Curated annotation (Swiss-Prot), chains A, B:
SUPFAM superfamilies: Glyoxalase/Bleomycin resistance protein/Dihydroxybiphenyl dioxygenase
Name of the protein described by the UniProt record: 4-hydroxyphenylpyruvate dioxygenase
NCBIfam families reported for this sequence: 4HPPD
Keyword terms: Cytoplasm, Dioxygenase, Iron, Metal-binding, Oxidoreductase, Phenylalanine catabolism, Repeat, Tyrosine catabolism
GO-annotated biological processes: L-phenylalanine catabolic process; tyrosine catabolic process
Stored Pfam families: Glyoxalase
Organism: Arabidopsis thaliana (Mouse-ear cress)
Assigned GO CC terms: cytoplasm
Lineage of the organism: Eukaryota, Viridiplantae, Streptophyta, Embryophyta, Tracheophyta
Assembly and interaction partners: Homodimer.
Amino acid sequence: NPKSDKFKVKRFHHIEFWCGDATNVARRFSWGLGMRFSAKSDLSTGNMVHASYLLTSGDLRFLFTAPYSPSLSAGEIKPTTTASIPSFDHGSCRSFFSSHGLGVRAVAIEVEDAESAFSISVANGAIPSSPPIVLNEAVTIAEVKLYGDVVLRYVSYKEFLPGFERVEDASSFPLDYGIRRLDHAVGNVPELGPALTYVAGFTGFHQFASGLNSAVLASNDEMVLLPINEPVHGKSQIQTYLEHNEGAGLQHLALMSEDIFRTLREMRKRSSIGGFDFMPSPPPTYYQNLKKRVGDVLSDDQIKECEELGILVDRDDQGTLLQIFTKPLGDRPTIFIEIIQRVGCMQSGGCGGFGKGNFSELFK
Amino acid sequence: NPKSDKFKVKRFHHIEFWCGDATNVARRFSWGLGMRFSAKSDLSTGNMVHASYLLTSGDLRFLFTAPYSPSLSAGEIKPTTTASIPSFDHGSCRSFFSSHGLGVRAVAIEVEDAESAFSISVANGAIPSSPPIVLNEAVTIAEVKLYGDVVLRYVSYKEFLPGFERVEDASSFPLDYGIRRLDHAVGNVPELGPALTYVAGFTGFHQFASGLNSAVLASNDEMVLLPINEPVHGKSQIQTYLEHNEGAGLQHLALMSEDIFRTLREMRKRSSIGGFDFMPSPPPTYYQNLKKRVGDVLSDDQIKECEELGILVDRDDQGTLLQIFTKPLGDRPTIFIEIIQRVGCMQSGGCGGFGKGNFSELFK
Ligand SMILES: COc1ccc(-c2c(S(C)(=O)=O)ccc(C(=O)c3cnn(C(C)(C)C)c3O)c2C)cc1
Ligand SMILES: COc1ccc(-c2c(S(C)(=O)=O)ccc(C(=O)c3cnn(C(C)(C)C)c3O)c2C)cc1
Ligand SMILES: [Fe+3]
Ligand SMILES: [Fe+3]
């Protein structure tokens, strides 16, 4: 839109979850989402600091990290660290998890120059989290505060980060349920205004046009979308999140699927056998009314298939979007996932909206 | 053997894992081990303190617990607690996990009288962890220190604990790979002598007849088996465990299978899709030699099936045992699982031994 990015942003690079045990979370997510085990950085690769496992599905990258006993790297100093992600900190990790529980620590975006991106962001009010560091004279990584204890990590290149080792053979089963990339990453905050002013201030991201108030910030080509909500008192779902999460943090990750019907069949088969659960499906009435609001974009047959899978539908102009939501990913009623597929706008980011019309249509 | 139990022990009741996120660990374990989601105690059941999920497979019960934000129960006091497991403590839980990582907090055994069991144990040198508390005038639970931060929980009745809610319908998929009960729970300690003297001292358990020294303690009917190892310096596998685990703790849980061949086929199918990995199989030579050492108990065909599944075999007198080991359950190279099936002794506990002969046969 006005295209005011203060630095060249390319696209989402990865999402990093800080966990208690990386192995168990990553394996659960791999099976439930159909993401392949692609790379690792841990004791077997010489990393005495943290255990990190990368899952991939198309362009989507989910990183799962947990801290080893500090005792293993007690003789190291930053200049001699065996960690592959220099920003990692045992104390910060444990504190983050103890406070918020399983959740996203970093929303990483690929930029043309992470060093430049960091300096420009800070010059513009971003709170530094981790300075630019050049890994193997090939990749540069830097971090600034986004909201709560969630950071925005900048990654630039001159597969995954150096230090990581590609997973081979049978250790890497080719799971794939259709998920292809991260559409949007939404955060919950107590006060939307200051959060918007802060994030838009350091990145230059423009605004992309109950119980909550929301706003979507987007890069120049609107492919990187960072929405934010705040609660509206007088009980907000966003307020309950803030309480259980102990403050602001990522609310949901919307994952684009090249075939949402296939992704939902595959995910639903695995719900009760190690996978993810979905929220209760809409009533039959929602599908009756769907025939009247999107009848021109989806046949009666495509609508029945949406009903079988509990898929929700909504639309703007230019496009339509199919979406569905999982139940919380872990113990706390905080972070959850959204599976989405957009029809139209030939594709332009945000085609079809974000389903705000479903909040209403669902209640009816 | 001498049958010196100081109180009436019945059998293993459950194993409790203290986690960062109970939901994710429990769902991963459910799928990888084929254990049904049977009961829960969390926000939906009114528990504002902890999230606890029970998985069952035959008589085997695996409990997964994680602490919610203390803020949710900040107005509670022990006399008004909403926790279903009165021994739970946010601080202790977080400390345990931060220190050791994902692992067993409690090895629970059913006794005729948990109050009596606790008092007698303490009179005999057991270090109290949690006093006897009567839940819903129906179940009594008490805890004493076993080793490290692992406690021995006594449970007596007058399904699972009160407060827990049975999982119904589709929320409980009937997974079952053949696992039926807990055979033995082994702990690693720095000094075997004092640990044996301590545990045998308060329970009356009798001794059931490289790099390590081990000893097996057993109840009267030898159905409850609590083995313990210590490292032997001059690098012990047990020493590496102690370092990564930050001290003593449960090393492995041996799970009895009513059909180890079926359990291994099912588990192996799921290894790379959210399940558990197994250690590298024995060489073909191990199976050639197996034909000569157990040829009278297992046909050539049964031996080839053991080779396909990587199952190890060993024997004493009275019986033979089939066993296999998974790779560590979580991030740290600490706790792992053992799948076992015993042939003979018609069944008496410990029939066939524990595979000590395999340590040698494997190296060759
Ligand atoms: C907690 O239970 C839930 C789950 C999903 C929704 C829900 C619904 S519902 C009630 O229909 O199910 C419709 C759209 C969106 C949705 O994902 C969204 C809404 N606005 N935006 C922005 C980008 C503006 C934050 C989104 O990303 C969401 C989260 C609401 C409550
Ligand atoms: C860490 O890698 C491993 C995995 C398994 C074994 C292993 C082997 S191996 C080398 O053949 O694979 C054979 C038997 C047993 C076994 O489970 C055991 C041994 N003694 N006892 C007692 C009860 C006395 C502690 C047991 O419970 C075990 C743990 C050894 C190293
Ligand atoms: Fe969304
Ligand atoms: Fe064993």
